[PDB]
Amino acid sequence: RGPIAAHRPHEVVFGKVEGEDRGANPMDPPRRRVDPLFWLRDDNRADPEVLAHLHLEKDYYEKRAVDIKDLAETIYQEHISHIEETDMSAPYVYDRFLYYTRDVKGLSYKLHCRVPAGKTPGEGEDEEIVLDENKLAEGKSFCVVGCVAPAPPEHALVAYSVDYCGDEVYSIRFVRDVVADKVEGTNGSVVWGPNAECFFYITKDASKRDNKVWRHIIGQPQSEDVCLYTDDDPLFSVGVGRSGDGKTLIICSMSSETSESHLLDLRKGVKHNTLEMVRPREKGVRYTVEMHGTDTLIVLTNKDKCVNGKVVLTKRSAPTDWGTVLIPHDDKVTIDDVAVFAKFAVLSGRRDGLTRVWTVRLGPDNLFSSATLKELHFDEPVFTAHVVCSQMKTYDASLLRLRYSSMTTPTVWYDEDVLSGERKVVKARKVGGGFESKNYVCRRELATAPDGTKVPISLVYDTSIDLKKPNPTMLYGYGSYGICIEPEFNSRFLPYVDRGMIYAIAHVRGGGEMGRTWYEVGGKYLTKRNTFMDFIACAEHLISSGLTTPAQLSCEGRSAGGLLVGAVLNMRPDLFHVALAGVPFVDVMTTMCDPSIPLTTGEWEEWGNPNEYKFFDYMNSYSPIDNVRAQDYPHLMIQAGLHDPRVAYWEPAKWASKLRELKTDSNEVLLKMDLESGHFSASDRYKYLRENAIQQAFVLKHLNVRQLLR
Amino acid sequence: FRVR
């Protein structure tokens, strides 16, 4: 059998609790229930009984992972041969410099390099290596850099932020210790003031919320920093950014369904700290702000029932006047955000369930011209595109940087003249291991949800599999938050498709693939069960159209997708033969009732809050841990990370012990706990790829497919 | 930036 943890009685309370904050309107008298595995939680990650139990699990795992070591190996190499070990990124102008990233063949971390404006990017005499992450990571289990921020005009000072355990709290430091300043306990973002005199950062809080924006002045003890903005509302996080012209700073608050912004003038120097309210928060209203020069505010917003968004134009001096509408609201178009430059703006968004991008110019009047809206043309019918804003460093620019991809076409970055239309390639990704696009094809089916709704499916397969009989398939899902799983290129799936499998993305509600409403009405709060039923629907479609049979079908999810997996295995475990759930959000009731767990209060406006009558029962009906029962489940691998500040390590830990406890089948439930990494990791190395390989190994093992088609 |  497998490890089963011991039951220690602990009551967990739902509703009102004196001294704690369980939301605006919690249940009274409260409700109670027993969680016999509560103990598995240690906030300090140090309990001997717990760490011991995790060893049992590590033993079990290793003991059971012996006979895929060799396939995971054949597959790591495929990965490597698909990755391009020595590489340069797509170099961009930032001031008097071209900036770019570099990888070297033996080495696990990027280099951050620089070449002067009019020279040629590449390892050489001109190239200054700004940061070497390998020298940072020297004899350390874990190493992630949040930000590499040089200081405007000069780029003499460069600051960076680093997390050494993955709980995602950062220190900020400077390259080669040119100065001695240190900033502790930040979210990672560094934003600069003028002339390297100071910069802006964001501290965490109770339960790791981003609740404060501060100024740091060079030459000073952090203890002397000035906090500019707190938001005390547990539903919110604070953000911070710089205006195009860099004369204006942008402070905001973002809950899931509500926004607020302020402005600070950087032209008045380090001792000027007074903010300028933009539009006072109004529940239900979300909006984002972008400056044009010092006066004109270009606001993207959902106000007045404009769900997919509308972009408005107003003045700094009368910032609540939003009667001027630049781009009006469209039912079939979602606008996800704007970027604003001296001579135009990019809108990023959606139409027909694919990423789209438009550009908007000034008129002869020097004011933004509705009539100049251009939708940007791409070649493939099913593709993915975003503007790369982390590479648009120049306010006066005329070249706009895009990343373009499809499940067939390896990624391209290229510049495009906003006016001319012409597209030069900057970098096209190379894929070795003998890969070629013409070996693959991607089309889109539509599944039918129980309520009639059409759920899109995106799929890719080697052009030479026999489609006149069922095939082994992997069906991947997300879909929470309004986040979309894109049909973009991803080498990671080649090991499956290279062995005659069909890789497939279910576009379930909760996602935002089909517009904002695919998320807000379709899959959230009291309509969150669609996420799971839409998924189940996609999978039945795959079976009855004859693409697959459940003995040949697998599924994969991560994070909130782990939630999707766990619910779906609770309901229709018969549909799968094998299943992957990385860092899976699965102990929903228990976590969601408790304000102290790092992301709970944000997400009272996502799933709901089970301290409330309105939400208790509903969430209960899909909470994976709470719905584990005596029945067959398929082979399952769970991957967790000890310092995961997003999904707590104990969550999958319980779910794994409970599955083994109740499950009546005898398939394997393995649980891989990297005690060195967090949420995203597995790792920040070649070890990421090693981790990923076992996952594919485990599946392919269970599917009984090992053999390439070439 | 900050999610499940």
Side-chain angles (χ1 to χ4, degrees):
Chain A
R1 205 162 183 200
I4 293 163
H7 295 211
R8 313 225 192 102
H10 169 102
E11 85 190 328
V12 38
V13 180
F14 280 85
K16 193 178 189 184
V17 183
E18 290 272 300
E20 303 203 31
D21 160 57
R22 297 294 185 109
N25 163 44
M27 296 183 274
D28 180 17
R31 295 166 182 186
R32 336 179 89 92
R33 29 153 79 174
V34 286
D35 178 335
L37 300 181
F38 192 87
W39 72 275
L40 293 172
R41 173 167 162 207
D42 167 37
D43 280 1
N44 291 322
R45 334 256 150 178
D47 198 49
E49 313 214 60
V50 184
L51 293 188
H53 175 72
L54 289 188
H55 204 216
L56 285 151
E57 209 85 70
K58 191 205 92 238
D59 270 322
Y60 180 56
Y61 162 71
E62 253 138 74
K63 171 191 280 165
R64 202 75 177 204
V66 182
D67 50 293
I68 49 174
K69 291 269 166 174
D70 274 12
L71 175 63
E73 188 55 18
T74 343
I75 232 106
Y76 178 80
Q77 298 305 337
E78 282 177 58
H79 281 347
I80 287 275
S81 72
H82 288 152
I83 211 65
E84 74 168 338
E85 265 156 295
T86 303
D87 201 34
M88 193 163 319
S89 67
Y92 55 94
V93 162
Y94 199 160
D95 282 280
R96 192 255 168 331
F97 297 103
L98 272 153
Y99 276 69
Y100 56 92
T101 226
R102 286 213 297 106
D103 298 291
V104 195
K105 199 190 163 201
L107 312 204
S108 309
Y109 296 96
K110 10 216 81 188
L111 277 47
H112 297 254
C113 322
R114 184 209 271 182
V115 138
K119 309 293 198 148
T120 312
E123 185 182 37
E125 64 150 316
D126 295 327
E127 163 182 286
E128 215 199 303
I129 298 176
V130 182
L131 192 77
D132 190 356
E133 297 193 5
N134 311 286
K135 296 217 296 169
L136 257 224
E138 174 56 6
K140 255 145 211 214
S141 38
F142 178 100
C143 181
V144 166
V145 181
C147 211
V148 179
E154 308 303 79
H155 302 244
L157 310 176
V158 29
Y160 70 105
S161 59
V162 59
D163 181 19
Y164 286 114
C165 65
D167 67 338
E168 278 172 68
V169 179
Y170 297 75
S171 9
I172 300 146
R173 278 174 203 138
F174 287 84
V175 184
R176 292 165 178 92
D177 283 72
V178 164
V179 304
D181 309 46
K182 281 143 206 170
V183 176
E184 304 295 315
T186 92
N187 69 348
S189 322
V190 189
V191 172
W192 279 99
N195 332 308
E197 254 130 30
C198 77
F199 73 69
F200 306 93
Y201 68 93
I202 280 178
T203 71
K204 252 84 177 179
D205 196 335
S207 314
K208 260 144 216 192
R209 196 174 106 259
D210 292 355
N211 73 313
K212 257 181 281 197
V213 187
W214 306 76
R215 203 189 291 257
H216 176 77
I217 300 167
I218 322 302
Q220 282 187 113
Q222 142 144 54
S223 74
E224 278 295 338
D225 298 333
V226 184
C227 165
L228 287 161
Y229 190 70
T230 318
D231 197 341
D232 265 324
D233 187 347
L235 299 172
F236 290 72
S237 288
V238 315
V240 73
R242 212 189 191 207
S243 59
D245 71 348
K247 274 88 86 53
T248 317
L249 197 77
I250 301 160
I251 284 186
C252 72
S253 265
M254 300 126 338
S255 86
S256 175
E257 49 202 32
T258 327
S259 293
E260 196 175 87
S261 276
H262 310 255
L263 299 185
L264 192 77
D265 189 1
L266 300 173
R267 308 161 319 169
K268 303 194 164 153
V270 288
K271 286 217 292 143
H272 162 84
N273 291 335
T274 63
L275 288 338
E276 319 181 354
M277 180 50 94
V278 177
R279 183 164 189 281
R281 56 178 70 183
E282 171 170 49
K283 219 253 162 149
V285 191
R286 291 164 50 247
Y287 74 90
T288 287
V289 172
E290 293 272 309
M291 307 282 301
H292 190 231
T294 49
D295 21 36
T296 137
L297 274 82
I298 294 160
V299 181
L300 155 72
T301 172
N302 77 326
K303 190 183 137 192
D304 316 293
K305 321 291 169 302
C306 301
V307 301
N308 286 5
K310 65 179 188 167
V311 59
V312 112
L313 221 160
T314 187
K315 288 138 186 187
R316 202 209 254 242
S317 49
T320 55
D321 190 42
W322 293 357
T324 326
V325 171
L326 184 75
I327 287 149
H329 181 251
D330 193 317
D331 284 330
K332 44 250 178 218
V333 176
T334 288
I335 308 153
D336 289 319
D337 105 333
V338 277
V340 169
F341 295 86
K343 273 170 204 156
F344 72 97
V346 216
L347 283 68
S348 259
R350 285 211 164 247
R351 190 184 34 71
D352 270 273
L354 304 169
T355 68
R356 261 98 200 194
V357 31
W358 313 266
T359 197
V360 79
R361 262 161 265 115
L362 303 194
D365 60 13
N366 293 327
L367 268 65
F368 268 105
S369 180
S370 314
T372 56
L373 184 100
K374 193 189 160 161
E375 191 187 296
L376 266 75
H377 188 268
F378 298 104
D379 45 336
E380 297 170 59
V382 52
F383 68 92
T384 312
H386 320 88
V387 18
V388 187
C389 273
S390 77
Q391 284 175 27
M392 316 257 32
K393 295 305 172 155
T394 123
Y395 186 63
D396 207 5
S398 48
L399 287 153
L400 146 142
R401 180 66 58 70
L402 317 154
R403 201 172 102 251
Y404 167 84
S405 204
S406 84
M407 290 189 289
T408 268
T409 286
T411 321
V412 182
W413 295 252
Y414 44 16
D415 286 328
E416 165 178 338
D417 192 64
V418 169
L419 222 96
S420 91
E422 84 211 44
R423 226 166 276 192
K424 301 173 173 197
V425 172
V426 179
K427 178 184 186 62
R429 191 214 175 144
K430 304 157 192 150
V431 195
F435 165 83
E436 10 187 29
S437 295
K438 50 173 207 128
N439 304 338
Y440 312 112
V441 291
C442 69
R443 36 135 164 175
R444 286 186 144 235
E445 322 275 310
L446 285 177
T448 298
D451 78 336
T453 336
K454 304 295 197 192
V455 182
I457 304 167
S458 280
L459 27 134
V460 47
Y461 51 92
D462 189 283
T463 189
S464 76
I465 53 145
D466 188 354
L467 287 192
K468 278 184 218 64
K469 40 85 169 144
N471 291 276
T473 283
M474 160 81 74
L475 176 72
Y476 176 96
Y478 197 67
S480 298
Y481 305 116
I483 293 161
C484 311
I485 307 308
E486 306 288 24
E488 68 206 335
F489 180 77
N490 173 50
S491 73
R492 239 88 89 2
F493 69 51
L494 282 148
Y496 293 129
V497 170
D498 282 347
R499 299 175 155 81
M501 290 192 81
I502 291 167
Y503 186 89
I505 305 149
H507 297 285
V508 299
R509 280 180 277 189
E513 288 98 344
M514 301 315 300
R516 180 83 174 156
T517 58
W518 197 247
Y519 157 62
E520 308 196 348
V521 302
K524 148 167 204 158
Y525 284 144
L526 302 177
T527 71
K528 185 52 178 192
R529 314 172 100 250
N530 291 329
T531 285
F532 317 129
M533 301 197 85
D534 287 1
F535 196 77
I536 275 155
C538 294
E540 300 243 52
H541 176 95
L542 279 162
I543 289 146
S544 67
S545 79
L547 294 208
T548 285
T549 68
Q552 304 177 82
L553 176 71
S554 60
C555 61
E556 179 191 8
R558 263 197 26 107
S559 195
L563 164 61
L564 175 166
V565 179
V568 159
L569 299 181
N570 270 330
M571 320 166 163
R572 288 310 300 281
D574 57 280
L575 286 190
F576 308 95
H577 190 71
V578 63
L580 299 176
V583 282
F585 179 26
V586 286
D587 187 25
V588 204
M589 300 289 279
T590 294
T591 298
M592 283 308 313
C593 86
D594 176 342
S596 79
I597 309 160
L599 289 173
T600 304
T601 65
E603 293 178 3
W604 288 343
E605 283 187 3
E606 175 72 13
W607 332 104
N609 181 1
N611 293 294
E612 311 197 339
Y613 305 112
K614 174 175 172 74
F615 281 114
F616 188 78
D617 182 278
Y618 193 91
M619 291 195 246
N620 192 59
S621 68
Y622 65 90
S623 194
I625 286 192
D626 292 298
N627 287 268
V628 157
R629 90 198 102 206
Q631 81 197 348
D632 304 349
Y633 294 87
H635 299 286
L636 171 74
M637 183 169 150
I638 308 147
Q639 184 272 292
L642 193 65
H643 308 276
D644 184 333
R646 286 174 190 219
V647 177
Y649 83 78
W650 55 83
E651 300 211 30
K654 303 189 180 196
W655 171 51
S657 174
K658 218 208 190 166
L659 279 157
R660 289 205 199 83
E661 204 203 331
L662 295 166
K663 81 185 199 51
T664 55
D665 65 293
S666 58
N667 306 307
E668 63 206 16
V669 173
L670 319 179
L671 151 73
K672 198 193 161 303
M673 183 72 92
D674 183 19
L675 329 142
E676 305 281 67
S677 63
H679 186 79
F680 275 113
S681 333
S683 47
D684 18 336
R685 241 218 104 177
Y686 275 77
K687 287 306 143 94
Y688 178 94
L689 290 187
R690 220 104 201 182
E691 262 257 35
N692 178 256
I694 259 75
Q695 255 132 58
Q696 299 194 279
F698 172 73
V699 164
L700 290 167
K701 178 183 164 187
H702 294 303
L703 261 10
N704 201 207
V705 280
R706 285 182 170 83
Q707 164 76 82
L708 307 94
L709 314 160
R710 278 92 205 247
Chain B
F1 254 37
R2 203 55 168 311
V3 279
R4 89 203 139 180

PDB file of all heavy atoms in Angstrom, chain A residues 603-621:
ATOM      1  N   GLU A 603      -8.866  35.939  -2.454  1.00  0.00           N
ATOM      2  CA  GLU A 603      -9.814  34.997  -3.099  1.00  0.00           C
ATOM      3  C   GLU A 603     -11.175  34.767  -2.438  1.00  0.00           C
ATOM      4  O   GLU A 603     -11.931  33.908  -2.891  1.00  0.00           O
ATOM      5  CB  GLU A 603      -9.146  33.631  -3.322  1.00  0.00           C
ATOM      6  CG  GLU A 603      -8.038  33.763  -4.341  1.00  0.00           C
ATOM      7  CD  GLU A 603      -7.258  32.517  -4.622  1.00  0.00           C
ATOM      8  OE1 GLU A 603      -7.560  31.434  -4.086  1.00  0.00           O
ATOM      9  OE2 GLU A 603      -6.301  32.650  -5.399  1.00  0.00           O
ATOM     10  N   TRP A 604     -11.495  35.504  -1.379  1.00  0.00           N
ATOM     11  CA  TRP A 604     -12.881  35.600  -0.990  1.00  0.00           C
ATOM     12  C   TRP A 604     -13.698  36.218  -2.148  1.00  0.00           C
ATOM     13  O   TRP A 604     -14.905  36.028  -2.244  1.00  0.00           O
ATOM     14  CB  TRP A 604     -13.062  36.377   0.313  1.00  0.00           C
ATOM     15  CG  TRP A 604     -12.607  35.642   1.518  1.00  0.00           C
ATOM     16  CD1 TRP A 604     -12.364  34.305   1.619  1.00  0.00           C
ATOM     17  CD2 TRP A 604     -12.365  36.188   2.821  1.00  0.00           C
ATOM     18  NE1 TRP A 604     -11.983  33.983   2.897  1.00  0.00           N
ATOM     19  CE2 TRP A 604     -11.969  35.128   3.651  1.00  0.00           C
ATOM     20  CE3 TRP A 604     -12.448  37.471   3.370  1.00  0.00           C
ATOM     21  CZ2 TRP A 604     -11.668  35.316   4.998  1.00  0.00           C
ATOM     22  CZ3 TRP A 604     -12.157  37.648   4.699  1.00  0.00           C
ATOM     23  CH2 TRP A 604     -11.772  36.581   5.500  1.00  0.00           C
ATOM     24  N   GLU A 605     -13.049  36.957  -3.036  1.00  0.00           N
ATOM     25  CA  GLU A 605     -13.733  37.454  -4.241  1.00  0.00           C
ATOM     26  C   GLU A 605     -13.405  36.633  -5.485  1.00  0.00           C
ATOM     27  O   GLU A 605     -13.413  37.138  -6.578  1.00  0.00           O
ATOM     28  CB  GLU A 605     -13.424  38.932  -4.477  1.00  0.00           C
ATOM     29  CG  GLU A 605     -14.168  39.856  -3.581  1.00  0.00           C
ATOM     30  CD  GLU A 605     -13.939  41.303  -3.978  1.00  0.00           C
ATOM     31  OE1 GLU A 605     -13.233  41.522  -4.991  1.00  0.00           O
ATOM     32  OE2 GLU A 605     -14.452  42.226  -3.288  1.00  0.00           O
ATOM     33  N   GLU A 606     -13.092  35.370  -5.302  1.00  0.00           N
ATOM     34  CA  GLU A 606     -12.877  34.481  -6.427  1.00  0.00           C
ATOM     35  C   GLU A 606     -13.804  33.264  -6.252  1.00  0.00           C
ATOM     36  O   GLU A 606     -14.768  33.137  -6.979  1.00  0.00           O
ATOM     37  CB  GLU A 606     -11.390  34.098  -6.572  1.00  0.00           C
ATOM     38  CG  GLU A 606     -11.065  33.074  -7.638  1.00  0.00           C
ATOM     39  CD  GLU A 606     -11.194  33.598  -9.075  1.00  0.00           C
ATOM     40  OE1 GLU A 606     -11.294  34.828  -9.248  1.00  0.00           O
ATOM     41  OE2 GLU A 606     -11.164  32.778 -10.036  1.00  0.00           O
ATOM     42  N   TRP A 607     -13.545  32.393  -5.288  1.00  0.00           N
ATOM     43  CA  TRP A 607     -14.397  31.237  -5.111  1.00  0.00           C
ATOM     44  C   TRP A 607     -15.609  31.668  -4.323  1.00  0.00           C
ATOM     45  O   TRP A 607     -16.700  31.219  -4.603  1.00  0.00           O
ATOM     46  CB  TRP A 607     -13.653  30.128  -4.354  1.00  0.00           C
ATOM     47  CG  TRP A 607     -12.215  30.216  -4.576  1.00  0.00           C
ATOM     48  CD1 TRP A 607     -11.291  30.686  -3.706  1.00  0.00           C
ATOM     49  CD2 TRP A 607     -11.518  29.903  -5.783  1.00  0.00           C
ATOM     50  NE1 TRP A 607     -10.053  30.671  -4.281  1.00  0.00           N
ATOM     51  CE2 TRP A 607     -10.163  30.186  -5.559  1.00  0.00           C
ATOM     52  CE3 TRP A 607     -11.911  29.420  -7.037  1.00  0.00           C
ATOM     53  CZ2 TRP A 607      -9.185  30.001  -6.541  1.00  0.00           C
ATOM     54  CZ3 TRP A 607     -10.930  29.214  -8.014  1.00  0.00           C
ATOM     55  CH2 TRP A 607      -9.588  29.512  -7.754  1.00  0.00           C
ATOM     56  N   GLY A 608     -15.383  32.572  -3.370  1.00  0.00           N
ATOM     57  CA  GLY A 608     -16.327  32.944  -2.336  1.00  0.00           C
ATOM     58  C   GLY A 608     -15.610  32.817  -0.996  1.00  0.00           C
ATOM     59  O   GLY A 608     -14.414  32.529  -0.980  1.00  0.00           O
ATOM     60  N   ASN A 609     -16.351  33.023   0.107  1.00  0.00           N
ATOM     61  CA  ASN A 609     -15.881  32.932   1.499  1.00  0.00           C
ATOM     62  C   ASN A 609     -16.729  31.953   2.337  1.00  0.00           C
ATOM     63  O   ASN A 609     -17.891  32.228   2.619  1.00  0.00           O
ATOM     64  CB  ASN A 609     -16.000  34.300   2.117  1.00  0.00           C
ATOM     65  CG  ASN A 609     -15.536  34.347   3.540  1.00  0.00           C
ATOM     66  OD1 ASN A 609     -15.087  33.357   4.119  1.00  0.00           O
ATOM     67  ND2 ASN A 609     -15.618  35.526   4.114  1.00  0.00           N
ATOM     68  N   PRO A 610     -16.155  30.820   2.763  1.00  0.00           N
ATOM     69  CA  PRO A 610     -17.045  29.841   3.360  1.00  0.00           C
ATOM     70  C   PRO A 610     -17.412  30.137   4.791  1.00  0.00           C
ATOM     71  O   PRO A 610     -18.123  29.361   5.408  1.00  0.00           O
ATOM     72  CB  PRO A 610     -16.271  28.530   3.244  1.00  0.00           C
ATOM     73  CG  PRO A 610     -14.860  28.926   3.224  1.00  0.00           C
ATOM     74  CD  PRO A 610     -14.801  30.279   2.550  1.00  0.00           C
ATOM     75  N   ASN A 611     -16.973  31.265   5.319  1.00  0.00           N
ATOM     76  CA  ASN A 611     -17.494  31.743   6.598  1.00  0.00           C
ATOM     77  C   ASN A 611     -18.918  32.306   6.461  1.00  0.00           C
ATOM     78  O   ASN A 611     -19.521  32.764   7.440  1.00  0.00           O
ATOM     79  CB  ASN A 611     -16.558  32.820   7.153  1.00  0.00           C
ATOM     80  CG  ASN A 611     -15.197  32.264   7.537  1.00  0.00           C
ATOM     81  OD1 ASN A 611     -15.086  31.447   8.473  1.00  0.00           O
ATOM     82  ND2 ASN A 611     -14.149  32.701   6.824  1.00  0.00           N
ATOM     83  N   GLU A 612     -19.447  32.288   5.242  1.00  0.00           N
ATOM     84  CA  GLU A 612     -20.736  32.888   4.943  1.00  0.00           C
ATOM     85  C   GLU A 612     -21.773  31.871   4.466  1.00  0.00           C
ATOM     86  O   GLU A 612     -21.459  30.996   3.628  1.00  0.00           O
ATOM     87  CB  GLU A 612     -20.548  33.909   3.844  1.00  0.00           C
ATOM     88  CG  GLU A 612     -19.426  34.869   4.074  1.00  0.00           C
ATOM     89  CD  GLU A 612     -19.512  36.109   3.207  1.00  0.00           C
ATOM     90  OE1 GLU A 612     -20.183  36.087   2.166  1.00  0.00           O
ATOM     91  OE2 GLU A 612     -18.890  37.131   3.566  1.00  0.00           O
ATOM     92  N   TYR A 613     -23.018  31.994   4.939  1.00  0.00           N
ATOM     93  CA  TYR A 613     -24.075  31.126   4.424  1.00  0.00           C
ATOM     94  C   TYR A 613     -24.143  31.099   2.884  1.00  0.00           C
ATOM     95  O   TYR A 613     -24.393  30.082   2.287  1.00  0.00           O
ATOM     96  CB  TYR A 613     -25.429  31.545   4.944  1.00  0.00           C
ATOM     97  CG  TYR A 613     -25.571  31.628   6.430  1.00  0.00           C
ATOM     98  CD1 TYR A 613     -25.746  32.865   7.056  1.00  0.00           C
ATOM     99  CD2 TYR A 613     -25.584  30.481   7.218  1.00  0.00           C
ATOM    100  CE1 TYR A 613     -25.911  32.963   8.421  1.00  0.00           C
ATOM    101  CE2 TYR A 613     -25.733  30.569   8.597  1.00  0.00           C
ATOM    102  CZ  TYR A 613     -25.915  31.814   9.190  1.00  0.00           C
ATOM    103  OH  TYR A 613     -26.069  31.914  10.558  1.00  0.00           O
ATOM    104  N   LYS A 614     -23.918  32.228   2.246  1.00  0.00           N
ATOM    105  CA  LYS A 614     -24.055  32.329   0.806  1.00  0.00           C
ATOM    106  C   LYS A 614     -23.160  31.356   0.094  1.00  0.00           C
ATOM    107  O   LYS A 614     -23.490  30.959  -0.995  1.00  0.00           O
ATOM    108  CB  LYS A 614     -23.751  33.768   0.344  1.00  0.00           C
ATOM    109  CG  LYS A 614     -23.690  34.062  -1.184  1.00  0.00           C
ATOM    110  CD  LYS A 614     -23.498  35.616  -1.449  1.00  0.00           C
ATOM    111  CE  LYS A 614     -23.226  36.040  -2.917  1.00  0.00           C
ATOM    112  NZ  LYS A 614     -24.450  35.958  -3.742  1.00  0.00           N
ATOM    113  N   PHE A 615     -22.058  30.945   0.724  1.00  0.00           N
ATOM    114  CA  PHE A 615     -20.955  30.221   0.038  1.00  0.00           C
ATOM    115  C   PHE A 615     -20.498  28.890   0.631  1.00  0.00           C
ATOM    116  O   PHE A 615     -19.899  28.074  -0.078  1.00  0.00           O
ATOM    117  CB  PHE A 615     -19.719  31.103  -0.016  1.00  0.00           C
ATOM    118  CG  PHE A 615     -19.755  32.144  -1.070  1.00  0.00           C
ATOM    119  CD1 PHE A 615     -19.790  33.497  -0.716  1.00  0.00           C
ATOM    120  CD2 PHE A 615     -19.727  31.796  -2.411  1.00  0.00           C
ATOM    121  CE1 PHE A 615     -19.805  34.497  -1.673  1.00  0.00           C
ATOM    122  CE2 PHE A 615     -19.731  32.786  -3.371  1.00  0.00           C
ATOM    123  CZ  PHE A 615     -19.774  34.153  -2.991  1.00  0.00           C
ATOM    124  N   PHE A 616     -20.736  28.695   1.931  1.00  0.00           N
ATOM    125  CA  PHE A 616     -20.494  27.387   2.606  1.00  0.00           C
ATOM    126  C   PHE A 616     -20.837  26.154   1.744  1.00  0.00           C
ATOM    127  O   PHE A 616     -19.931  25.515   1.236  1.00  0.00           O
ATOM    128  CB  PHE A 616     -21.204  27.298   3.974  1.00  0.00           C
ATOM    129  CG  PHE A 616     -20.835  26.094   4.757  1.00  0.00           C
ATOM    130  CD1 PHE A 616     -19.625  26.049   5.451  1.00  0.00           C
ATOM    131  CD2 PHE A 616     -21.666  24.988   4.778  1.00  0.00           C
ATOM    132  CE1 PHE A 616     -19.245  24.883   6.189  1.00  0.00           C
ATOM    133  CE2 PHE A 616     -21.323  23.823   5.500  1.00  0.00           C
ATOM    134  CZ  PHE A 616     -20.104  23.772   6.217  1.00  0.00           C
ATOM    135  N   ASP A 617     -22.123  25.860   1.554  1.00  0.00           N
ATOM    136  CA  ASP A 617     -22.548  24.630   0.851  1.00  0.00           C
ATOM    137  C   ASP A 617     -21.984  24.426  -0.548  1.00  0.00           C
ATOM    138  O   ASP A 617     -21.542  23.316  -0.923  1.00  0.00           O
ATOM    139  CB  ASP A 617     -24.073  24.475   0.799  1.00  0.00           C
ATOM    140  CG  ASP A 617     -24.507  23.167   0.121  1.00  0.00           C
ATOM    141  OD1 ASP A 617     -24.550  23.130  -1.144  1.00  0.00           O
ATOM    142  OD2 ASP A 617     -24.803  22.163   0.829  1.00  0.00           O
ATOM    143  N   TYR A 618     -22.033  25.489  -1.324  1.00  0.00           N
ATOM    144  CA  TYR A 618     -21.598  25.418  -2.712  1.00  0.00           C
ATOM    145  C   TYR A 618     -20.153  24.956  -2.830  1.00  0.00           C
ATOM    146  O   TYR A 618     -19.876  23.986  -3.517  1.00  0.00           O
ATOM    147  CB  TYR A 618     -21.753  26.772  -3.391  1.00  0.00           C
ATOM    148  CG  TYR A 618     -21.630  26.688  -4.859  1.00  0.00           C
ATOM    149  CD1 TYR A 618     -22.752  26.500  -5.643  1.00  0.00           C
ATOM    150  CD2 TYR A 618     -20.411  26.815  -5.477  1.00  0.00           C
ATOM    151  CE1 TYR A 618     -22.657  26.433  -7.023  1.00  0.00           C
ATOM    152  CE2 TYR A 618     -20.308  26.746  -6.850  1.00  0.00           C
ATOM    153  CZ  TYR A 618     -21.434  26.553  -7.613  1.00  0.00           C
ATOM    154  OH  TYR A 618     -21.336  26.469  -8.971  1.00  0.00           O
ATOM    155  N   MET A 619     -19.247  25.660  -2.155  1.00  0.00           N
ATOM    156  CA  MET A 619     -17.855  25.305  -2.149  1.00  0.00           C
ATOM    157  C   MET A 619     -17.646  23.902  -1.619  1.00  0.00           C
ATOM    158  O   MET A 619     -16.839  23.136  -2.127  1.00  0.00           O
ATOM    159  CB  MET A 619     -17.107  26.310  -1.301  1.00  0.00           C
ATOM    160  CG  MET A 619     -17.053  27.685  -1.947  1.00  0.00           C
ATOM    161  SD  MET A 619     -15.830  28.742  -1.175  1.00  0.00           S
ATOM    162  CE  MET A 619     -16.969  29.899  -0.526  1.00  0.00           C
ATOM    163  N   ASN A 620     -18.397  23.550  -0.601  1.00  0.00           N
ATOM    164  CA  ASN A 620     -18.325  22.217  -0.094  1.00  0.00           C
ATOM    165  C   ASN A 620     -18.541  21.124  -1.176  1.00  0.00           C
ATOM    166  O   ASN A 620     -17.914  20.094  -1.147  1.00  0.00           O
ATOM    167  CB  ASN A 620     -19.279  22.078   1.074  1.00  0.00           C
ATOM    168  CG  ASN A 620     -19.058  20.814   1.817  1.00  0.00           C
ATOM    169  OD1 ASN A 620     -17.972  20.552   2.323  1.00  0.00           O
ATOM    170  ND2 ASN A 620     -20.067  19.971   1.835  1.00  0.00           N
ATOM    171  N   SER A 621     -19.409  21.379  -2.139  1.00  0.00           N
ATOM    172  CA  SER A 621     -19.812  20.392  -3.128  1.00  0.00           C
ATOM    173  C   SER A 621     -18.746  20.099  -4.165  1.00  0.00           C
ATOM    174  O   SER A 621     -18.864  19.121  -4.941  1.00  0.00           O
ATOM    175  CB  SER A 621     -21.070  20.843  -3.844  1.00  0.00           C
ATOM    176  OG  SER A 621     -20.845  21.978  -4.663  1.00  0.00           O
TER     177      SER A 621
END
